[PDB]
Nucleic acid binder design. Structure first.
Ligand SMILES: [Zn+2]
Ligand SMILES: [Zn+2]
Length: 157
DNA sequence: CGATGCGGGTGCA
DNA sequence: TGCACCCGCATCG
């Protein structure tokens, strides 16, 4: 159909089950199939943290921002550093203290707010044959490394 | 260690 | 009633 939100009931003549989106931005809405393993795990390559909206039916999550090198540093091939923020709150504290992996300077956590000045949010709800997606905002800060990229660091020498 | 989900409880419109 | 958010509980890779 056309209109879509967190409404009472969601239409179900879905023919177009969008393919899993990695970087939902600009208020994107989707209809991923519920067999979609990445849609099941409510993934996003943006660092999104769980948010409690008191509703077991709508999984809401808000954007953490992105960790950058406060010293504005840039590698040799002109690469800037955007670390993926830790999701566990206490971990992000211990993280902002760690030194930059490039210029060994201090790290700074730039937060998101591409929504009326508040961290961009997402919304997941499973309605039978599929998982519906909807977000509110547009990230006003550079993209972190992916869960996949981030883990590449930690799992090294 | 942390990613993720959950939900009680708070402070502001 | 909505929304943002702090805090602890629990699971699981
Ligand atoms: Zn640096
Ligand atoms: Zn963002």
């Amino acid at each position: 159909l056309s209109w879509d939100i967190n409404d009472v009931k969601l239409p179900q003549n879905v023919k177009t089950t969008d393919w899993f989106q990695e970087w939902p931005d600009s208020y994107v809405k989707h209809i991923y199939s519920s067999d979609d393993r990445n849609a099941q795990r409510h993934l996003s390559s943006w660092a999104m943290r769980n948010t409690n909206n008191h509703n077991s039916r709508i999984l809401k999550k808000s954007c953490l921002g992105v960790v950058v090198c406060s010293r504005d540093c840039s590698t040799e091939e002109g690469r800037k550093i955007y670390l993926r923020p830790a999701i566990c709150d206490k971990a992000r504290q211990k993280q902002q203290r760690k030194s930059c992996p490039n210029c060994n300077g201090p790290l700074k956590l730039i937060p998101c707010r591409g929504h009326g000045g508040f961290p961009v949010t997402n919304f997941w709800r499973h309605d039978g044959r599929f998982i519906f997606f909807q977000s509110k905002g547009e990230h006003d800060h550079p993209r972190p490394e992916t869960k996949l990229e981030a883990e590449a660091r930690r799992a090294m020498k």
